[PDB]
Amino acid sequence: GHYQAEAALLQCTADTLADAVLITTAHAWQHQGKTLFISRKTYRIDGSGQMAITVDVEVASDTPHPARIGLNCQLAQVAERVNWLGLGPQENYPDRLTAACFDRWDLPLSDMYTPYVFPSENGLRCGTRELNYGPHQWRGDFQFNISRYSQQQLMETSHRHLLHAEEGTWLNIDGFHMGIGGDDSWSPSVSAEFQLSAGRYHYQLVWCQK
Amino acid sequence: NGLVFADRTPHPALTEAKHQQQFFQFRLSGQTIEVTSEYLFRHSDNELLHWMVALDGKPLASGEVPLDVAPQGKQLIELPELPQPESAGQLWLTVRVVQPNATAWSEAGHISAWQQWRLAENLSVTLPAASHAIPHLTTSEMDFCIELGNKRWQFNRQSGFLSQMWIGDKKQLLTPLRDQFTRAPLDNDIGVSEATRIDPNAWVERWKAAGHYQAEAALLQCTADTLADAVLITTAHAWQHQGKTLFISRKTYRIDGSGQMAITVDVEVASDTPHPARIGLNCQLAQVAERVNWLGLGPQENYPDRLTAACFDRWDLPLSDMYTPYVFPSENGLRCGTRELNYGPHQWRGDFQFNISRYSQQQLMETSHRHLLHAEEGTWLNIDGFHMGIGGDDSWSPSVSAEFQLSAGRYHYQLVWCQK
Ligand SMILES: O[C@@H]1[C@H](O)[C@@H](O)OC[C@@H]1O
Ligand SMILES: O[C@@H]1[C@H](O)[C@@H](O)OC[C@@H]1O
Ligand code: NA
Ligand code: NA
Ligand code: NA
């Protein structure tokens, strides 16, 4: 039920500190009475203009290891360029990133999507400490992809030529992402060390304007 | 270099050897246990299999089946349908091979093999009932104090550490709660087979030269806030040697109305410093209790690269059994994969490794022989989010495998301290 799990709110509170507002949330993801994932977050917005997102995730040990652990949203802004400090410049995944180099990369938005004829998750970059897109900047230690196509459209469309740019830009920011495998393509092939099996996961992100 | 002491008392290593050298191998598929014999000649004619299902140490079902396995052969053991657990938590399956009859070499009831698996886990989605009391913050020049009835928390604003805790009038700590990144070096960390030959490549020497052992905490941030139902202490420290920052510890302490102190720790390790022996906290407790009770890996001493023999369960031992008397003293007595620890009035919860004893890491590394060790006042506790492997492929060069070195650069753990 990973694809049809629904977020059930467990907690949502606000607090006022000396220099910041602090939002605390908790969600459970559930399918047919079973809790798959729990996400606990803090959003700390301070006087500088920065939002610090702290995420801790629990994953039931008896559910198949999830493909990713991160956040996504659809930004209204469409910009020409994507600028990042992390692995690149090309698409790289945790078990296919040895060729990528850590540096400051800057590509047109289109180069951030890989036109696989049969569409799937694509264009991820790993080891990213900073991502700039229009007026937005994200900082932390994460993996991301950014494009005009939702994960939903990608999995529903059988051929690349049938895809249509959605309004604005879909961003996927992952603390953690599963390997892609490939030793063969007809049996599970992602090695154990690249499966998200640690049960508890922590990542932090800082969102701001430049 | 023995698996047993001179008087033939086992070192902790012995049990790891027993487990890896088992003659029965096990696989689980759904509810079926597959038993494979590694015997070449004998049938399993003095063996029965005990199984036991438990939820966080609480037994929920058990049974026996005799083993009837030809040499090199297999046996399938279908478990009965198991009663579903009411409460949250992780179910664990344990199996043991027991020899019912005495032999020339063993006594009746001798356990020759064991294995564990996680079964179903039910994550907790229930919010604990909103506590009645609210903690109060007292801001002085020297301290951030926190009160909740009889209980008190004191955070020294100059050190940035929790210097003292009170229950009524009784003091709880003899030494403040501080980050620790070093361990009393093991024989494998020292890495010599000859007395005069120094190896600058050995873990202990790389650590010493980097200043790990004499790095001092420098306060970068100590702040307090009042929340709707809690007090939040936020600290940030930097450990430095000869102008070089080795680690940075960012923490939040959260004390709520129920009297629980939640510690969230985020550590930065400079990539060009030798990987640290441990990422944890320590303190000297005032108390001296007879028993140590924990939910985690045990019962014996176990380390990240020597923990396969340990079983996750509820263990209760006399405190002295939580110290391993290695003739040449070092870091010892660690237990891994621990979710709950109970000592006197204290309970710590999270997902951590710990050791507990009357001996500080400082004394252990300064004393050459076990007979020269002296029990100190109170109990030293080391609680680690992460601990480096012990190695041993040999004892005269670095032997700790890469997957067991603390090289991630950024580390996160969380502890909850309370009274039960
Ligand atoms: O080769 C090892 C070492 O070099 C020597 O000094 O101690 C004995 C061991 O075999
Ligand atoms: O504790 C270690 C050992 O006991 C000593 O002989 O060499 C370096 C280090 O101090
Ligand atoms: Na598709
Ligand atoms: Na038998
Ligand atoms: Na010593």
XYZ file of C-alpha atoms and ligand atoms in Angstrom:
653
model
C 0.000 0.000 0.000
C 2.937 2.416 -0.334
C 1.372 4.159 -3.352
C -2.108 4.510 -1.790
C -1.173 5.211 1.856
C -2.912 8.243 3.375
C -1.363 10.735 5.796
C -3.242 10.725 9.122
C -2.456 13.725 11.320
C -1.229 12.872 14.797
C -0.016 16.294 15.924
C 0.125 19.931 14.846
C 1.236 22.636 17.277
C 2.691 26.138 17.172
C 5.102 27.827 19.607
C 6.634 31.290 19.909
C 10.312 31.550 20.862
C 12.681 34.496 21.462
C 13.615 34.816 17.779
C 11.494 32.182 16.015
C 8.136 30.496 15.472
C 8.303 26.698 15.889
C 5.826 24.350 14.163
C 5.757 20.708 15.300
C 3.963 17.955 13.347
C 3.515 14.204 13.342
C 1.885 12.002 10.703
C 1.234 8.290 10.343
C 0.948 6.604 6.941
C -1.486 3.760 6.926
C -2.941 1.181 4.588
C -5.810 -1.044 5.714
C -5.095 -0.685 9.454
C -1.318 -1.090 9.130
C 1.071 1.788 9.931
C 3.852 1.851 7.331
C 5.622 5.127 8.086
C 5.604 7.813 10.746
C 6.984 11.280 10.049
C 7.827 13.722 12.858
C 8.878 17.235 11.896
C 9.848 20.640 13.244
C 9.710 23.778 11.140
C 11.734 26.560 12.750
C 11.281 29.981 11.114
C 13.498 32.745 12.530
C 14.260 36.465 12.138
C 16.714 35.928 9.277
C 13.981 34.501 7.003
C 15.107 30.890 7.083
C 12.975 27.823 7.685
C 14.770 24.852 9.237
C 12.986 21.591 8.530
C 13.977 18.706 10.783
C 12.569 15.311 9.723
C 12.673 11.990 11.594
C 10.994 8.985 10.034
C 10.079 5.544 11.357
C 9.538 2.721 8.865
C 7.883 -0.493 9.957
C 10.460 -3.274 9.771
C 8.017 -5.694 8.160
C 7.026 -3.409 5.297
C 9.155 -3.621 2.118
C 11.918 -1.032 2.237
C 10.641 2.214 0.701
C 12.045 3.639 -2.539
C 12.801 7.010 -0.897
C 12.407 9.049 2.268
C 11.975 12.719 1.517
C 9.645 15.559 0.715
C 8.009 16.838 -2.429
C 5.974 19.795 -3.652
C 4.984 21.599 -6.833
C 6.535 25.074 -7.051
C 4.572 27.752 -8.970
C 7.772 29.249 -10.386
C 9.311 27.978 -13.616
C 12.921 29.084 -14.037
C 15.437 28.537 -16.853
C 18.353 27.304 -14.704
C 19.146 24.913 -11.845
C 22.267 25.615 -9.803
C 23.665 23.165 -7.222
C 26.593 22.236 -5.044
C 26.664 18.437 -5.073
C 27.295 15.447 -7.314
C 27.041 15.973 -11.045
C 26.625 17.222 -13.541
C 24.669 14.189 -14.800
C 21.978 12.037 -13.230
C 23.399 9.934 -10.406
C 21.884 7.517 -7.865
C 23.345 6.031 -4.692
C 24.653 2.879 -6.449
C 25.485 4.791 -9.637
C 27.360 7.925 -8.465
C 31.084 7.101 -8.683
C 31.427 9.023 -11.987
C 29.803 12.197 -10.629
C 32.043 14.893 -9.194
C 31.297 17.169 -6.266
C 31.279 20.752 -7.512
C 29.174 23.782 -8.411
C 26.949 22.772 -11.316
C 24.563 24.901 -13.372
C 22.319 23.417 -16.061
C 19.151 24.331 -17.972
C 16.013 22.854 -16.383
C 15.580 20.392 -19.298
C 18.962 18.731 -18.562
C 17.594 17.860 -15.111
C 15.170 15.423 -16.697
C 16.333 12.191 -18.379
C 14.142 11.250 -21.361
C 14.027 7.475 -20.813
C 11.669 6.155 -23.484
C 9.710 4.258 -20.852
C 9.301 6.979 -18.160
C 10.285 6.447 -14.541
C 11.944 8.249 -11.627
C 14.817 10.092 -13.256
C 17.346 12.890 -13.016
C 18.281 12.517 -9.354
C 21.515 14.078 -8.093
C 23.071 12.887 -4.837
C 25.436 14.430 -2.241
C 23.851 17.858 -2.626
C 24.613 20.515 -0.017
C 22.862 23.380 -1.809
C 20.206 23.794 -4.494
C 19.142 27.076 -6.132
C 15.995 27.446 -8.270
C 14.642 30.916 -9.041
C 14.346 32.744 -5.712
C 14.590 29.548 -3.649
C 17.614 27.969 -1.998
C 17.734 24.665 -0.120
C 20.656 23.629 2.097
C 21.467 20.363 3.885
C 22.753 16.951 2.761
C 20.254 15.449 0.375
C 19.310 14.012 -3.006
C 16.955 15.796 -5.384
C 15.322 15.844 -8.761
C 13.559 18.783 -10.321
C 11.406 18.840 -13.483
C 8.010 19.649 -15.019
C 6.708 16.084 -14.439
C 5.166 14.630 -11.294
C 6.116 11.199 -10.009
C 2.435 10.408 -10.686
C 2.499 11.419 -14.369
C 5.747 9.519 -14.868
C 4.345 6.266 -13.555
C 1.075 6.666 -15.538
C 2.628 7.426 -18.936
C 4.087 4.537 -20.964
C 6.031 6.561 -23.524
C 8.129 9.703 -23.112
C 6.527 11.525 -26.081
C 3.126 11.388 -24.370
C 4.350 13.425 -21.365
C 3.163 17.029 -20.884
C 4.864 19.736 -18.806
C 2.720 20.332 -15.755
C 2.164 23.826 -14.323
C 5.225 24.978 -12.389
C 8.025 22.690 -11.231
C 7.901 19.414 -9.290
C 10.654 19.142 -6.687
C 11.634 15.932 -4.909
C 14.057 16.430 -2.034
C 15.167 13.189 -0.475
C 17.127 12.617 2.688
C 17.494 9.057 1.429
C 16.952 7.204 -1.858
C 17.108 3.482 -2.705
C 19.620 2.099 -5.210
C 18.517 1.524 -8.810
C 20.094 -1.935 -9.311
C 20.611 -3.509 -12.729
C 22.716 -6.680 -12.312
C 19.704 -7.903 -14.251
C 16.272 -6.356 -14.937
C 13.938 -9.273 -14.129
C 14.572 -10.056 -10.464
C 15.325 -7.861 -7.444
C 18.853 -6.532 -8.015
C 19.408 -3.622 -5.577
C 22.120 -4.711 -3.150
C 21.389 -4.799 0.615
C 23.662 -1.843 1.421
C 21.577 0.335 -0.936
C 18.181 -0.625 0.509
C 16.509 1.719 2.969
C 16.356 -0.773 5.837
C 17.652 1.192 8.844
C 14.096 1.568 10.269
C 14.747 5.083 11.598
C 15.868 7.970 9.396
C 16.929 11.527 10.071
C 17.513 14.466 7.762
C 17.438 18.277 7.967
C 16.823 21.001 5.367
C 17.035 24.789 5.379
C 14.772 26.702 2.967
C 15.290 30.412 2.273
C 15.241 33.186 -0.335
C 18.235 34.693 -2.116
C 45.407 -13.735 23.134
C 42.955 -16.308 24.480
C 39.232 -16.891 24.069
C 39.370 -17.908 27.754
C 41.327 -16.419 30.713
C 44.187 -18.425 32.218
C 41.759 -19.998 34.730
C 39.499 -20.999 31.770
C 36.785 -18.423 32.460
C 35.397 -17.353 29.039
C 36.152 -13.978 27.487
C 33.072 -12.486 25.790
C 34.582 -13.515 22.418
C 33.956 -17.222 23.151
C 30.175 -16.970 22.707
C 30.610 -15.277 19.306
C 32.806 -18.200 18.276
C 30.218 -20.726 19.530
C 27.429 -19.074 17.501
C 29.335 -18.704 14.214
C 30.555 -22.294 14.475
C 27.039 -23.698 14.954
C 26.296 -26.989 13.217
C 22.714 -26.041 12.437
C 21.808 -23.245 10.021
C 18.401 -21.575 9.902
C 16.166 -19.775 7.440
C 12.744 -18.251 8.019
C 10.104 -17.912 5.324
C 6.819 -16.521 6.607
C 6.071 -18.969 9.408
C 8.301 -21.866 8.327
C 11.725 -22.461 9.910
C 14.174 -24.324 7.684
C 16.844 -26.213 9.612
C 19.991 -27.320 7.764
C 22.499 -29.737 9.282
C 26.230 -29.095 8.771
C 27.087 -32.483 10.305
C 28.755 -34.834 7.852
C 28.072 -38.160 9.599
C 25.644 -37.924 12.524
C 21.860 -37.574 12.524
C 20.432 -35.030 14.987
C 19.607 -37.768 17.534
C 20.139 -35.641 20.657
C 18.507 -32.387 19.628
C 15.226 -30.568 20.039
C 14.274 -27.093 18.855
C 12.786 -24.573 21.241
C 11.174 -21.509 19.764
C 9.806 -18.456 21.545
C 7.983 -15.359 20.348
C 8.203 -12.197 22.446
C 7.125 -8.581 22.166
C 9.858 -6.296 23.533
C 10.974 -9.044 25.940
C 7.437 -10.100 26.943
C 6.845 -13.782 26.052
C 3.701 -14.334 23.967
C 4.106 -17.950 22.738
C 6.581 -20.840 22.799
C 6.995 -24.503 21.782
C 9.266 -27.503 21.179
C 9.774 -29.742 18.143
C 12.297 -32.564 17.993
C 14.987 -32.244 15.324
C 15.189 -35.107 12.868
C 17.829 -34.001 10.400
C 20.047 -36.300 8.357
C 23.694 -35.161 7.978
C 23.731 -32.396 5.326
C 19.912 -32.590 5.239
C 16.985 -30.260 5.890
C 13.900 -30.095 8.100
C 10.950 -27.749 7.776
C 9.225 -26.647 10.946
C 5.916 -24.906 10.447
C 5.089 -22.725 13.448
C 1.485 -22.613 14.704
C -0.627 -19.525 13.962
C 0.588 -16.949 16.482
C -1.688 -14.831 18.731
C -1.695 -11.240 17.453
C -0.255 -8.665 19.880
C -2.507 -5.982 21.339
C 0.081 -3.278 22.103
C 2.695 -1.656 19.848
C 6.267 -2.882 19.322
C 8.486 -5.408 17.593
C 7.858 -9.142 17.696
C 11.037 -11.247 17.871
C 11.416 -14.958 17.112
C 14.181 -16.860 18.937
C 15.065 -20.499 18.320
C 17.492 -22.669 20.329
C 18.845 -26.153 19.701
C 18.915 -28.033 23.010
C 20.533 -31.412 23.668
C 18.149 -33.208 26.096
C 20.595 -36.001 27.024
C 24.054 -35.816 28.613
C 27.090 -36.774 26.525
C 30.744 -37.466 27.365
C 31.359 -33.746 26.674
C 28.157 -31.989 27.762
C 25.345 -31.967 30.313
C 21.624 -32.491 29.686
C 20.012 -29.226 28.523
C 23.163 -27.957 26.728
C 22.302 -25.334 24.100
C 24.291 -25.924 20.886
C 22.773 -23.316 18.539
C 20.475 -20.309 18.323
C 19.141 -17.685 15.896
C 16.841 -14.662 15.970
C 14.547 -12.899 13.477
C 12.237 -9.891 13.643
C 8.622 -10.804 12.852
C 5.763 -8.295 12.657
C 6.314 -4.791 14.026
C 3.458 -2.488 15.010
C 4.527 1.152 15.209
C 3.074 3.242 18.048
C 0.613 5.900 16.873
C -0.965 6.697 20.251
C -0.143 10.066 21.812
C 0.698 9.746 25.529
C -1.941 11.497 27.703
C -1.249 15.240 28.070
C 0.639 15.681 31.348
C -0.784 17.860 34.115
C 2.258 19.741 35.432
C 4.311 22.293 33.490
C 8.083 22.742 34.073
C 9.409 26.143 35.165
C 12.509 27.908 33.844
C 14.781 29.900 36.176
C 17.314 32.066 34.311
C 20.351 33.139 36.366
C 23.743 34.442 35.183
C 25.375 31.078 35.947
C 22.582 28.528 35.348
C 19.392 27.567 33.520
C 17.444 25.718 36.210
C 14.319 23.646 35.507
C 11.792 22.624 38.167
C 8.979 20.064 38.158
C 7.786 19.215 41.684
C 10.604 17.366 43.483
C 12.771 17.187 40.337
C 15.344 19.758 39.194
C 17.627 20.175 36.163
C 20.628 22.500 36.205
C 22.379 23.592 32.999
C 25.689 25.450 33.539
C 25.642 28.465 31.182
C 29.452 28.661 31.015
C 30.120 24.982 30.174
C 26.870 24.383 28.252
C 26.425 20.993 29.924
C 23.915 19.472 32.345
C 26.004 19.878 35.496
C 23.446 18.542 38.026
C 20.067 16.813 38.542
C 18.043 16.485 41.766
C 15.322 14.156 43.022
C 14.089 15.790 46.215
C 17.338 16.679 47.989
C 19.473 13.841 46.534
C 22.083 14.860 43.948
C 22.112 12.627 40.856
C 25.427 13.382 39.091
C 29.044 13.454 40.321
C 30.330 14.630 36.926
C 28.298 16.593 34.313
C 26.812 14.952 31.168
C 29.367 15.570 28.397
C 30.031 14.403 24.834
C 32.702 11.708 24.580
C 34.487 10.847 21.323
C 37.259 8.587 22.632
C 37.546 5.153 24.240
C 40.165 3.573 26.503
C 42.203 1.957 23.714
C 41.768 -1.776 23.101
C 44.750 -4.027 22.357
C 43.658 -3.835 18.675
C 43.582 0.009 18.810
C 47.141 -0.028 20.223
C 48.368 -2.389 17.536
C 51.740 -3.742 18.593
C 53.105 -7.327 18.706
C 56.463 -6.097 20.019
C 57.043 -3.632 22.891
C 59.549 -1.164 21.339
C 57.948 -0.840 17.887
C 55.683 2.226 17.729
C 53.215 2.324 14.830
C 52.018 5.842 13.860
C 49.398 4.052 11.757
C 47.693 2.337 14.734
C 44.291 3.733 15.761
C 45.468 4.875 19.212
C 48.368 6.843 17.680
C 46.279 8.469 14.955
C 43.797 9.507 17.680
C 46.507 10.825 20.066
C 48.223 12.842 17.305
C 44.920 14.405 16.216
C 44.205 15.568 19.780
C 41.127 13.376 20.292
C 42.127 12.602 23.879
C 42.857 16.199 24.920
C 40.405 18.169 22.793
C 38.477 20.541 25.031
C 34.854 21.655 24.641
C 34.320 25.268 23.544
C 30.866 26.803 23.998
C 29.305 28.282 20.872
C 25.675 28.501 22.023
C 23.583 27.972 25.156
C 19.957 29.148 25.029
C 16.619 28.559 26.753
C 12.976 28.801 25.660
C 9.550 28.279 27.216
C 7.210 26.069 25.171
C 3.459 25.520 25.685
C 4.157 22.488 27.908
C 7.985 22.241 28.136
C 11.391 23.917 28.526
C 13.852 23.773 25.597
C 17.625 24.042 26.170
C 19.650 24.388 22.940
C 23.445 23.976 23.070
C 26.265 24.018 20.519
C 29.888 23.032 21.239
C 33.144 22.738 19.286
C 36.046 20.379 20.152
C 39.371 21.835 19.073
C 43.059 20.923 19.011
C 45.856 23.268 17.915
C 43.317 25.570 16.195
C 41.506 22.683 14.473
C 37.863 21.834 15.053
C 37.521 18.051 15.323
C 33.835 17.688 16.203
C 30.784 19.930 16.631
C 27.943 18.800 18.920
C 24.558 20.486 18.419
C 21.941 19.537 21.019
C 18.424 20.222 22.200
C 17.192 19.225 25.660
C 13.410 19.039 26.058
C 11.877 18.557 29.506
C 8.084 18.140 29.550
C 5.362 17.954 32.250
C 5.717 14.190 32.682
C 9.354 14.616 33.756
C 10.949 13.276 30.595
C 14.136 14.853 29.260
C 14.488 14.313 25.509
C 18.032 14.770 24.228
C 18.543 15.228 20.479
C 22.223 15.187 19.410
C 23.673 16.098 16.002
C 27.422 15.673 15.552
C 29.735 16.961 12.810
C 33.079 15.139 12.417
C 35.772 16.821 10.283
C 36.439 14.486 7.345
C 40.255 14.790 7.694
C 40.398 13.777 11.350
C 40.851 10.039 12.047
C 37.431 8.442 12.504
C 36.408 8.560 16.180
C 36.097 5.551 18.489
C 32.589 6.571 19.610
C 29.939 9.237 19.303
C 28.167 9.461 22.618
C 27.697 11.030 26.018
C 28.998 10.151 29.485
C 28.599 11.132 33.134
C 29.276 9.812 36.602
C 26.039 8.911 38.414
C 25.911 9.280 42.211
C 23.966 6.029 42.641
C 25.411 2.516 43.080
C 22.759 -0.136 42.359
C 23.098 -3.920 42.410
C 21.284 -4.578 39.133
C 21.384 -3.510 35.485
C 18.279 -4.176 33.421
C 18.099 -3.526 29.678
C 16.065 -4.181 26.580
C 18.626 -4.820 23.859
C 21.437 -7.098 22.751
C 22.813 -9.513 25.306
C 23.335 -10.841 27.792
C 27.134 -10.746 27.249
C 29.388 -7.896 26.150
C 28.885 -7.189 22.424
C 30.287 -4.749 19.862
C 29.111 -3.644 16.398
C 31.461 -6.108 14.649
C 31.013 -8.758 17.333
C 27.234 -8.849 18.051
C 25.828 -11.819 16.101
C 25.832 -14.108 19.170
C 23.815 -11.627 21.257
C 20.027 -11.802 21.294
C 17.619 -8.906 21.578
C 15.662 -9.465 24.789
C 15.145 -8.215 28.352
C 18.274 -8.788 30.393
C 18.884 -8.335 34.091
C 22.386 -8.692 35.481
C 24.371 -7.840 38.607
C 26.364 -4.647 37.847
C 29.786 -6.351 38.067
C 28.813 -8.662 35.132
C 28.630 -5.442 33.067
C 32.396 -5.129 33.373
C 34.751 -7.493 31.511
C 37.942 -8.028 33.521
C 40.460 -8.065 30.621
C 43.880 -8.396 32.286
C 45.059 -5.377 30.327
C 42.185 -2.971 30.938
C 40.414 -1.141 28.111
C 36.960 -0.078 26.991
C 34.795 -3.107 27.761
C 31.322 -4.323 28.649
C 29.444 -2.571 25.836
C 25.991 -3.776 24.817
C 24.530 -2.715 21.472
C 21.074 -2.264 19.913
C 19.630 -1.058 23.218
C 16.176 0.590 23.341
C 15.751 0.812 27.124
C 18.215 0.888 30.047
C 17.318 0.797 33.757
C 19.669 1.653 36.567
C 18.463 2.564 40.050
C 15.840 5.317 39.538
C 17.023 6.043 35.991
C 15.641 4.840 32.686
C 17.078 5.853 29.312
C 15.246 5.114 26.098
C 16.264 5.405 22.443
C 18.419 3.265 20.162
C 21.940 3.141 21.509
C 24.970 1.293 22.850
C 26.029 1.600 26.491
C 28.504 0.418 29.080
C 28.129 0.780 32.836
C 30.654 0.226 35.631
C 32.582 1.748 38.519
C 35.505 2.526 36.168
C 35.930 5.659 34.067
C 37.489 5.496 30.601
C 40.305 7.665 32.057
C 41.164 5.088 34.733
C 40.928 2.180 32.280
C 43.471 3.771 29.898
C 45.785 4.759 32.769
C 45.894 1.398 34.552
C 48.064 -1.371 33.082
C 46.666 -4.309 35.085
C 43.085 -5.231 36.132
C 44.137 -5.769 39.782
C 45.228 -2.120 40.079
C 41.760 -0.780 39.215
C 39.814 0.862 42.034
C 36.024 1.249 42.113
C 35.270 4.977 41.854
C 32.460 6.808 43.664
C 29.143 6.170 41.892
C 28.669 4.667 38.446
C 30.233 5.734 35.171
C 27.839 5.520 32.247
C 28.805 5.776 28.602
C 25.848 6.041 26.199
C 26.729 6.007 22.520
C 24.621 6.697 19.478
C 27.526 5.136 17.579
C 30.570 3.056 18.465
C 33.453 1.927 16.259
C 34.233 -1.739 15.670
C 36.880 -3.565 17.686
C 38.711 -5.380 14.820
C 41.001 -8.337 15.494
C 41.867 -9.892 12.106
C 45.223 -9.251 13.673
C 46.251 -7.078 16.656
C 49.312 -5.330 15.161
C 47.804 -3.198 12.380
C 44.507 -1.390 11.796
C 41.991 -4.228 11.465
C 38.614 -2.514 11.857
C 36.732 -2.978 8.595
C 35.476 0.139 6.725
C 31.755 -0.524 7.338
C 32.460 -0.373 11.107
C 34.429 2.895 11.112
C 32.595 6.061 12.096
C 33.132 7.840 8.761
C 29.712 9.296 7.835
C 30.796 12.823 8.916
C 27.307 13.700 10.254
C 25.626 11.705 13.003
C 22.260 11.890 14.772
C 20.964 10.165 17.871
C 18.242 10.798 20.464
C 17.888 9.776 24.101
C 15.028 10.156 26.539
C 15.955 10.296 30.233
C 13.310 9.917 32.952
C 12.500 8.316 36.314
C 10.453 5.100 36.534
O 53.655 -11.608 12.232
C 53.133 -11.120 13.478
C 54.006 -9.966 13.990
O 54.705 -9.346 12.898
C 55.019 -10.446 15.020
O 55.777 -9.339 15.533
O 54.287 -11.093 16.062
C 53.841 -12.382 15.653
C 52.915 -12.305 14.437
O 53.063 -13.536 13.719
O 47.243 3.985 26.033
C 48.181 3.720 24.974
C 49.251 2.715 25.424
O 48.978 2.207 26.740
C 50.634 3.359 25.373
O 51.648 2.428 25.773
O 50.864 3.800 24.032
C 50.049 4.902 23.617
C 48.745 5.044 24.412
O 48.939 6.022 25.445
Na 5.878 4.879 -16.742
Na 16.517 -35.467 18.376
Na 44.987 0.359 30.147
